[PDB]
Amino acid sequence: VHLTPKEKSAVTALWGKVNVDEVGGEALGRLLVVYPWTQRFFESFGDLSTPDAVMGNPKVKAHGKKVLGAFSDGLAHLDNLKGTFATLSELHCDKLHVDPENFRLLGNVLVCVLAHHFGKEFTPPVQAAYQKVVAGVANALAHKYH
Amino acid sequence: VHLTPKEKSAVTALWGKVNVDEVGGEALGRLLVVYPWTQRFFESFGDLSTPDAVMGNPKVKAHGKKVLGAFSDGLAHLDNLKGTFATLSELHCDKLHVDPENFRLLGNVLVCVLAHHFGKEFTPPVQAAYQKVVAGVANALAHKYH
Amino acid sequence: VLSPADKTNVKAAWGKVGAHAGEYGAEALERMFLSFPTTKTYFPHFDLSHGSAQVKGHGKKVADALTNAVAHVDDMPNALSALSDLHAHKLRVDPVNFKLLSHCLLVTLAAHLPAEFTPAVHASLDKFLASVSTVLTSKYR
Amino acid sequence: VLSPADKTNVKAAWGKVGAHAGEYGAEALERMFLSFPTTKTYFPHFDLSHGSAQVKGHGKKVADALTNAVAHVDDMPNALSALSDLHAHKLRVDPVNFKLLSHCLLVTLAAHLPAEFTPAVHASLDKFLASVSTVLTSKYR
Ligand code: HEM
Ligand code: HEM
Ligand code: HEM
Ligand code: HEM
């Protein structure tokens, strides 16, 4: 996906301020709460009975951390997302059989979490740049389907 | 997209029996009838007030013929759909701004039209092969978005 | 919303299905499993091969639910309430999958009922299956 | 379906919006136009640049409709019937676009109401906007 220099600037500047220990868990937790069918893939994580249970779950926080790591890795290789996400694509598509619509949903939940954390700093043009990114990541993760 | 030889065989054998003067118009007409918001892009085609009006419209039949032509062209280049649909992608994405979900819808309407025309010959494995094809075409047509 | 003509079209088309109801449901499932392999994971206790008695039996169940919806088309949320709880809560079926099965049901009807599958009736059946899908995805918690 | 807690959450969150209602609606539209440029084609008679009086005015209209839906949350099909006719018949808005505007409304609320945008309230607001979208796409003909 192609970002303008202005968009690359906006994206990288904000990402440097991201709490990498927390934001991924917040996004994954909110995915599980807002789109409850996604809990089907996380039965081994234990207590997901309430939103508080989900957000406080140590396994949700720990996994979210790896997801964010993957998004961080994507931001470093915006012109080769397919190669970057190849192994993850095989995992999520060939092994897990997650419907790729959910890749889009998690990306949009991440965008909501960024808006929550950054407030007015998450301007409409900054959001538009991040939407290009999470669409790119979703499409790359879905490559094994198409 | 990758079809097995058995799937390629099923696809090419059926496609040779397709009425290339009619099937495209039937698919485009049904898209306009079943998903009426798509009529937004065809105001110049005239009478679209009833299903009979749509299916009998000479402009719908004529355009459908070109669409099918594009699908036929895709079937000949299953391992290079991106290049095959590059100009069409620029038209539909950059100029027309059609949401790419509608590429999927038209592909699925075509599959329904093939089922209608071929009956029990359109077996579940034949359908599964055609679903790979129309997904490939939709993804290639949407390339300018991602 | 389903129009008076939609309800008439759906009742008429589904009336032609007859004793083939269960058979068509089983075929729609098979089409879905082959075309959209992600959907197979919901049925690990099923053998999903052709001629599977489990897919046959399940197709009948699916068809009986659609027939219930047709028979109670003005009261579908109530008629399908138990099935909504099942699919959304217990089974956690991804809402995308209802679009996939709906498409395979249309393909099945098109392949078996060429006279009935007019453009108008195709449109009515699509609206009906979308309405059914809306009810079955209405209970996510 | 919206639960009692959902309705409570939505009424509470929307209550915090206040005199900023029109402003937030305008911002959600701007976010949608910039993020999802396909949506711009519905507004050729609009200048869609930042600070556009037309986008500002329209945002208020959108917000007033959402406020109507909140105030009549148990009777939304009736309350939004005229707006459903408009968007589906006259304007022929693609149903995908309602998901896009709904997401931009959530982002706008998250960016302005950090205390209110809890995971539970996020879930309730998503269900509410999906319900609104379901009504506004219910009249395609
Ligand atoms: C942009 C979207 C996504 C990204 C970047 C992502 C990234 C990741 C990463 C980095 C891992 C760890 C893999 C490893 O341990 O080597 C993982 C595992 C996993 N993902 Fe995701 N993921 C995404 C979407 C999803 C969604 C939507 C679901 C389900 C609804 C899902 C289900 C899972 C599961 C169940 C695992 C554990 C697999 C295992 O441990 O065997 N993922 N994902
Ligand atoms: C797989 C999906 C599709 C294929 C293969 C396809 C193919 C084509 C082809 C071959 C043309 C003729 C271009 C030319 O004259 O050189 C065309 C034009 C057009 N298409 Fe499609 N199309 C698809 C989907 C759609 C959809 C879903 C819409 C709208 C809902 C749409 C709207 C249009 C319009 C308005 C034109 C006329 C453009 C012009 O004459 O300037 N297309 N398409
Ligand atoms: C038109 C849409 C659908 C209808 C009418 C329908 C109907 C039914 C019925 C009648 C049952 C049996 C209920 C019972 O025995 O208590 C059932 C069970 C089930 N459905 Fe569906 N269904 C639909 C869509 C789906 C989809 C899209 C999926 C997943 C891709 C799905 C997955 C399942 C599963 C896994 C079961 C349980 C099977 C078992 O454990 O024996 N359904 N459905
Ligand atoms: C939550 C979803 C939405 C709400 C509450 C909403 C509300 C409204 C309202 C209140 C009006 C003015 C009605 C009037 O003046 O009679 C309107 C008009 C309009 N809407 Fe929406 N709308 C929604 C979604 C959308 C979407 C997704 C699109 C397209 C992407 C769209 C395109 C339009 C257009 C083109 C107009 C007419 C503008 C004009 O010609 O002045 N709407 N909407």
What domains are there in chain B, each with its CATH number? 1-146 (1.10.490.10)
A21 touches C76 (CB < 8 A):
no
Map tokens 């138990």 to a residue.
Answer: C82
CA A31 – CA B49 distance, rounded (Å): 43
Ligand 2 centre distance from Cα of residue B138 (Å): 12
Closest Cα partner for C1 from C101, C97, C130, C122? Answer: C130
Q: Which residues contact B123 (CB under 8 A, 6 or more apart)?
A: none
Tell me which DSSP letter residue D118 carries.
-
Q: Is A61 flagged in the annotation as binding?
A: no
Ligand 1 pocket residues where CB is under 6 Å: A 38, 41-42, 66-67, 70-71, 88, 92, 96, 98, 102-103, 106-107, 137-138, 141
In terms of CA atoms, which chain A residue is nearest residue C88?
A37
D87 touches D97 (CB < 8 A):
no
D13 phi and psi angles, rounded to 5 deg:
-65, -45
D63 touches D25 (CB < 8 A):
yes
Does residue C39's CB lie within 6 angstroms of at least one atom of ligand 3? yes
Q: Whose CA is nearest to atom 4 of ligand 2?
A: B67
Tell me which DSSP letter residue B92 carries.
I
Q: How many CA atoms lie within 13 A of A137 on its CB side?
A: 27
**CA-only gyration radius of chain D, Å:** 14
Specify the experimental method: X-ray
SS (H, E, C) chain C: CCCHHHHHHHHHHHHHHHHHHHHHHHHHHHHHHHHCHHHHHHCCCCCCCCCCHHHHHHHHHHHHHHHHHHHCHHHHHHHCHHHHHHHHHHCCCCCHHHHHHHHHHHHHHHHHCCCCCCHHHHHHHHHHHHHHHHHHCCCCC
Q: Which residues contact A105 (CB under 8 A, 6 or more apart)?
A: A31, A35, A38
Count, residues in chain C: 141
How many structural domains compose chain D?
A: 1
Q: What is the CATH number of the domain that holds D65?
A: 1.10.490.10
Enter the resolution in angstroms: 1.5
Smallest Cα distance from B32 to chain D, Å: 10
Residue among D84, D87, D135 whose CB has most ligand 4 atoms within 8 A, to mutate? D87
Q: Which residues of B touch A146 (CB under 8 A)?
A: 1, 135-136, 139
Q: Is A2 flagged in the annotation as binding?
A: yes
The boundaries of the domain holding residue C53 are: 1-141
CA B34 – CA B40 distance, rounded (Å): 13
